[PDB]
Amino acid sequence: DPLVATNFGKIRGIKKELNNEILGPVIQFLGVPYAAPPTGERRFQPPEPPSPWSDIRNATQFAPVCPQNIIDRLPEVMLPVWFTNNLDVVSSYVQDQSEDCLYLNIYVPTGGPKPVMVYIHGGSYMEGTGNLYDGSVLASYGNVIVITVNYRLGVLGFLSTGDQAAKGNYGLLDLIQALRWTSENIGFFGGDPLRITVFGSGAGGSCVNLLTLSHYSEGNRWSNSTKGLFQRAIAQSGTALSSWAVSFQPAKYARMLATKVGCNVSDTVELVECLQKKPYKELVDQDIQPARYHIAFGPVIDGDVIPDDPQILMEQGEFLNYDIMLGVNQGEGLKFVENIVDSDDGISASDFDFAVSNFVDNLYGYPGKDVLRETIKFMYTDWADRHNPETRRKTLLALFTDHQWVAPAVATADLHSNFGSPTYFYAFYHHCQTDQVPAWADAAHGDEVPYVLGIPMIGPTELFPCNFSKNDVMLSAVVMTYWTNFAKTGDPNQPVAWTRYSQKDQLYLHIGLKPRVKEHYRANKVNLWLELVPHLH
Amino acid sequence: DPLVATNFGKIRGIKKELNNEILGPVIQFLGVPYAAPPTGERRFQPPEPPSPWSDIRNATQFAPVCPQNIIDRLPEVMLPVWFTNNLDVVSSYVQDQSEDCLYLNIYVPTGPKPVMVYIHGGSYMEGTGNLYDGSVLASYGNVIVITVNYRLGVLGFLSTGDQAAKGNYGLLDLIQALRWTSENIGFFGGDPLRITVFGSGAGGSCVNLLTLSHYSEGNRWSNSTKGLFQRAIAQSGTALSSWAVSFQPAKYARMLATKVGCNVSDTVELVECLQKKPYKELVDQDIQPARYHIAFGPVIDGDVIPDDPQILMEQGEFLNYDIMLGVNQGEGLKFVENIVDSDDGISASDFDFAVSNFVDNLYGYPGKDVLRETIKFMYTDWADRHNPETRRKTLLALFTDHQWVAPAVATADLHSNFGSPTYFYAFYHHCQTDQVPAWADAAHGDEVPYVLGIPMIGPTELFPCNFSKNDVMLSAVVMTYWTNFAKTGDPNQPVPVAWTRYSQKDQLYLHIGLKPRVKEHYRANKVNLWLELVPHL
Ligand SMILES: *[C@@H]1O[C@H](CO)[C@@H](O)[C@H](O)[C@H]1NC(C)=O
Ligand SMILES: *[C@@H]1O[C@H](CO)[C@@H](O)[C@H](O)[C@H]1NC(C)=O
């Protein structure tokens, strides 16, 4: 049997055969505590280390996930499509909940310590679990250790009063704790604590980026030369600079919740103490909605974990030199457009104007809006066929995609390479059409996930039920190789050459069935939001 | 010897051998009167027909050109570069002047042939058809070529805003030449029902303006074809540009009247006063308009020009001619030439100044702040935003696009829209002179020597460039397109790389270079800025 001794006790994993000939087996350690349960007085408090246990602890089944409610209005626009498309399956992964949810899962392959890829999930900061992301194939195919983590979500993980009463960022601190646990225990599993790659998609991608800006991710016990906890980062369709990356009005929504559950909101210490006497179910189940493209509960600017606005930090180059790799998908903004399209696959010029105008209002309140609505309306029309209704959606979809994902990604990519971090950029332009998605839709938000995890190798799963072709399998194998090569050496080419990114040339890898390296991804539309729109104010 | 009988008498031309083996000889009839001298009481009056002569009139030397002053200064930005580059040679063509200058030149090769009437023009102020030798074009193409001299500057376009001086005398002269041609060219072996008019620059403007005038309607030969001429080619010139037509004619008529001592309350007295003065005195007065506008030119008289060409075009008020338009890569050379430093680049400093003054001259604030920023963004290549060699290339494009390209596309669009067989091109080659920078591309008027077939003869006093073997080949191709178009209204058919018909939807055009290809939507990104965005602002 597979036994492993850790600094808190011995644990037993479980061997797992994969449904493919090319793939060797993996031992998976499910439900490994990396922190003390954040219950009672430790709610709204930094994570403490886990209690040691005397005997052998079985790590063979998922632990209950962190409190969340996806069955009872959720922001489809932030959430991956494969998530919202089959919530029924996703729900079975989230049924068993508990405030005691700080657990991570290890996937170990089968003559030196292996790289460790720690996955950080995330949709809107409100929900999800690392359990959804099976790390078996990636570990086996890549010959690396893969870890998935569960961190505090929503209220419990990010509620803040704007005071020392509740400073917030408990979720990010949990991630820090999981990374420290990993740093100081993964070696016992045959992992290399000095080649740890952190990677995540969506809000998970945001979390990855936010950590690189935090001084809590500085320093590791093993090396005086390498002062990072983790050494590399991959942020997939997520950044720290988007409108919904961090919560800017945390005290507002903390008051709201406290009110809704009947707690006095005058004194902040009294407010917090009251919330702590209430079930997590009651706090989670309250209806708290922010602005359309903003969040209520998430990462906050506390002057500690996150010392300042991520924008300012990046500009001042306030981050350790990590090997970075970030990118976006062709059509992230599917769910922004999906409700608008009619029986034929197009949107009228009428609906177009409404959508673009409301977009301007939500993200750019008039101080001057008139000018802006026209500049954008112009920029996101293809005059080649200005009356085509099928082309109007593709470009409207591009508006959301560019502003919410692409421009933030490029800005991030630019500033990292600018300050000396080996940066790599990509554009994911393939996917596997499900019977739940339109036939005209391209690579949407989160569609790159199943390729990174190697799902096509195993074939359709309950979570990813698409009929993966042979092209899907090959593309997946290519992706996993880039990722894992990057994990092994900080170079996606060293275990089509993926060239290093730089602000001048802005070379990136266009990922498709025919992967090529291009240059200046959508710079025309990008520089609009980074150079023009700001100067108009 | 070559004798020809016309409705006004017999005339003797002169045979001319061309300096190329492939070219047969041509008989050229130089100094043929097509109208009575507009002298004395016929100054500021429509052109009357020429007097008949009993004997043989020798047409073997150029007649004196229309009054003009380039020696005493010259709007370099409107004028072709080959013009301003060697004024010494150009001057020899303009030395001998006379108000009696309504003469045209015939070039006959060796059924009835097509007739190509060339309409010269720089700023409406100067020039002559004599500069444009039509020998090679006629010989190579096997068509008759005509060059015309029409009234210029004050004498040709002065208007008081009254019936006292209605203006457009120059345009009426062109009409007179065309009527003369229609009713006499048959005697030379020409086809009065296959007359093509073509011109570059202001000449191009003149071509376009004629298509909007009802005076070019009706011919004596056919009841089905309602046009005097049947086809039109407008090279780097339109009726929609800022300097195509004079909108403040009365202002500048008074200015002149003032300088010569004729400023009178009553316009009929004013005109009568100007009529008692030498043409030299009127031509030599210093009258300069706004930076990108004209003082003396085509005017909106409600007769010859029934309304603003823009309105006319939009309402489709024009006969359906076979149309052909295009521009050169870098028309706006002379806009930028003064700015470049020893290195072939312009600083970010000078750039902002040049662009801002451009905004002020063409778009005086009534809102300018927004506009200068929108433009500054659109005309910078963010690929390398700091490159000084690239800053000039894009600033040059600003002028080029606004003054030439956008007016051309708009014209091209509205013509094809209302049913005229339209054709579009972009001229991307030239022959670098020791007078032009080595970094300059196809500038204003650089397509002329290729249209006239000069590379076939080799360097001339006017076109002294060392034409290569490729130049000769490209010229043959250009002349073939032009002459095919004259013959059949189709640049692909001589009788009775395929250049595809243009249309507002597909907007196919011929990219003319050493490797001529058909592309689509020429600089539509930059065009639609001026046609769709800035207006709505
Ligand atoms: C732990 O699990 C293994 C297999 O998963 C099993 O053999 C063992 O008996 C379990 N231990 C306990 C104490 O239940
Ligand atoms: C025209 O030229 C002929 C010879 O070609 C000559 O006899 C005649 O005198 C000339 N005409 C005039 C008006 O000089």
PDB file of N, CA, C and O in Angstrom, chain B residues 428-448:
ATOM      1  N   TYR B 428       1.561  51.673 -55.497  1.00  0.00           N
ATOM      2  CA  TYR B 428       2.589  51.447 -54.487  1.00  0.00           C
ATOM      3  C   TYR B 428       3.968  51.252 -55.107  1.00  0.00           C
ATOM      4  O   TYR B 428       4.758  50.422 -54.657  1.00  0.00           O
ATOM      5  N   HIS B 429       4.254  52.021 -56.148  1.00  0.00           N
ATOM      6  CA  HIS B 429       5.585  52.025 -56.733  1.00  0.00           C
ATOM      7  C   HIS B 429       5.923  53.412 -57.250  1.00  0.00           C
ATOM      8  O   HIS B 429       5.039  54.242 -57.454  1.00  0.00           O
ATOM      9  N   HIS B 430       7.212  53.654 -57.456  1.00  0.00           N
ATOM     10  CA  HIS B 430       7.673  54.899 -58.045  1.00  0.00           C
ATOM     11  C   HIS B 430       9.147  54.778 -58.404  1.00  0.00           C
ATOM     12  O   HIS B 430       9.763  53.732 -58.200  1.00  0.00           O
ATOM     13  N   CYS B 431       9.701  55.854 -58.947  1.00  0.00           N
ATOM     14  CA  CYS B 431      11.101  55.887 -59.333  1.00  0.00           C
ATOM     15  C   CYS B 431      11.793  56.993 -58.547  1.00  0.00           C
ATOM     16  O   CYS B 431      11.575  58.177 -58.804  1.00  0.00           O
ATOM     17  N   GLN B 432      12.625  56.604 -57.587  1.00  0.00           N
ATOM     18  CA  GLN B 432      13.233  57.574 -56.684  1.00  0.00           C
ATOM     19  C   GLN B 432      14.232  58.462 -57.422  1.00  0.00           C
ATOM     20  O   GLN B 432      15.172  57.985 -58.059  1.00  0.00           O
ATOM     21  N   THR B 433      13.995  59.766 -57.333  1.00  0.00           N
ATOM     22  CA  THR B 433      14.880  60.772 -57.901  1.00  0.00           C
ATOM     23  C   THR B 433      15.918  61.185 -56.864  1.00  0.00           C
ATOM     24  O   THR B 433      15.771  60.882 -55.680  1.00  0.00           O
ATOM     25  N   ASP B 434      16.968  61.870 -57.305  1.00  0.00           N
ATOM     26  CA  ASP B 434      17.949  62.425 -56.381  1.00  0.00           C
ATOM     27  C   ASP B 434      17.340  63.604 -55.615  1.00  0.00           C
ATOM     28  O   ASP B 434      17.948  64.129 -54.682  1.00  0.00           O
ATOM     29  N   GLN B 435      16.136  64.011 -56.015  1.00  0.00           N
ATOM     30  CA  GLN B 435      15.438  65.119 -55.373  1.00  0.00           C
ATOM     31  C   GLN B 435      14.510  64.655 -54.248  1.00  0.00           C
ATOM     32  O   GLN B 435      14.176  65.434 -53.355  1.00  0.00           O
ATOM     33  N   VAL B 436      14.094  63.393 -54.289  1.00  0.00           N
ATOM     34  CA  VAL B 436      13.215  62.858 -53.255  1.00  0.00           C
ATOM     35  C   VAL B 436      14.053  62.132 -52.213  1.00  0.00           C
ATOM     36  O   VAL B 436      15.115  61.599 -52.534  1.00  0.00           O
ATOM     37  N   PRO B 437      13.584  62.108 -50.958  1.00  0.00           N
ATOM     38  CA  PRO B 437      14.284  61.297 -49.956  1.00  0.00           C
ATOM     39  C   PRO B 437      14.331  59.824 -50.359  1.00  0.00           C
ATOM     40  O   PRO B 437      13.446  59.365 -51.081  1.00  0.00           O
ATOM     41  N   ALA B 438      15.348  59.101 -49.901  1.00  0.00           N
ATOM     42  CA  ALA B 438      15.499  57.691 -50.249  1.00  0.00           C
ATOM     43  C   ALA B 438      14.472  56.836 -49.516  1.00  0.00           C
ATOM     44  O   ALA B 438      14.228  55.687 -49.883  1.00  0.00           O
ATOM     45  N   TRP B 439      13.871  57.407 -48.479  1.00  0.00           N
ATOM     46  CA  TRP B 439      12.912  56.687 -47.649  1.00  0.00           C
ATOM     47  C   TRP B 439      11.467  56.896 -48.104  1.00  0.00           C
ATOM     48  O   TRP B 439      10.551  56.249 -47.597  1.00  0.00           O
ATOM     49  N   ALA B 440      11.266  57.798 -49.060  1.00  0.00           N
ATOM     50  CA  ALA B 440       9.920  58.157 -49.494  1.00  0.00           C
ATOM     51  C   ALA B 440       9.350  57.126 -50.464  1.00  0.00           C
ATOM     52  O   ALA B 440      10.053  56.624 -51.340  1.00  0.00           O
ATOM     53  N   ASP B 441       8.068  56.817 -50.293  1.00  0.00           N
ATOM     54  CA  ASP B 441       7.366  55.889 -51.172  1.00  0.00           C
ATOM     55  C   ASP B 441       6.668  56.657 -52.292  1.00  0.00           C
ATOM     56  O   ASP B 441       6.976  57.824 -52.534  1.00  0.00           O
ATOM     57  N   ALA B 442       5.735  56.000 -52.975  1.00  0.00           N
ATOM     58  CA  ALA B 442       4.997  56.629 -54.065  1.00  0.00           C
ATOM     59  C   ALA B 442       4.298  57.897 -53.579  1.00  0.00           C
ATOM     60  O   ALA B 442       3.333  57.831 -52.818  1.00  0.00           O
ATOM     61  N   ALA B 443       4.790  59.048 -54.026  1.00  0.00           N
ATOM     62  CA  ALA B 443       4.253  60.334 -53.592  1.00  0.00           C
ATOM     63  C   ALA B 443       3.226  60.879 -54.584  1.00  0.00           C
ATOM     64  O   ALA B 443       2.902  60.231 -55.579  1.00  0.00           O
ATOM     65  N   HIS B 444       2.717  62.074 -54.304  1.00  0.00           N
ATOM     66  CA  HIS B 444       1.701  62.693 -55.147  1.00  0.00           C
ATOM     67  C   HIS B 444       2.220  62.935 -56.561  1.00  0.00           C
ATOM     68  O   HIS B 444       3.250  63.581 -56.759  1.00  0.00           O
ATOM     69  N   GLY B 445       1.489  62.414 -57.542  1.00  0.00           N
ATOM     70  CA  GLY B 445       1.832  62.593 -58.939  1.00  0.00           C
ATOM     71  C   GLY B 445       2.852  61.606 -59.479  1.00  0.00           C
ATOM     72  O   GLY B 445       3.213  61.673 -60.655  1.00  0.00           O
ATOM     73  N   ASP B 446       3.318  60.689 -58.635  1.00  0.00           N
ATOM     74  CA  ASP B 446       4.354  59.738 -59.042  1.00  0.00           C
ATOM     75  C   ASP B 446       3.814  58.674 -59.994  1.00  0.00           C
ATOM     76  O   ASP B 446       4.586  57.944 -60.614  1.00  0.00           O
ATOM     77  N   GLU B 447       2.493  58.589 -60.109  1.00  0.00           N
ATOM     78  CA  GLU B 447       1.870  57.608 -60.992  1.00  0.00           C
ATOM     79  C   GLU B 447       1.729  58.145 -62.418  1.00  0.00           C
ATOM     80  O   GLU B 447       1.466  57.387 -63.349  1.00  0.00           O
ATOM     81  N   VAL B 448       1.922  59.448 -62.582  1.00  0.00           N
ATOM     82  CA  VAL B 448       1.778  60.094 -63.881  1.00  0.00           C
ATOM     83  C   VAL B 448       2.750  59.521 -64.914  1.00  0.00           C
ATOM     84  O   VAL B 448       2.330  59.142 -66.011  1.00  0.00           O
TER      85      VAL B 448
END
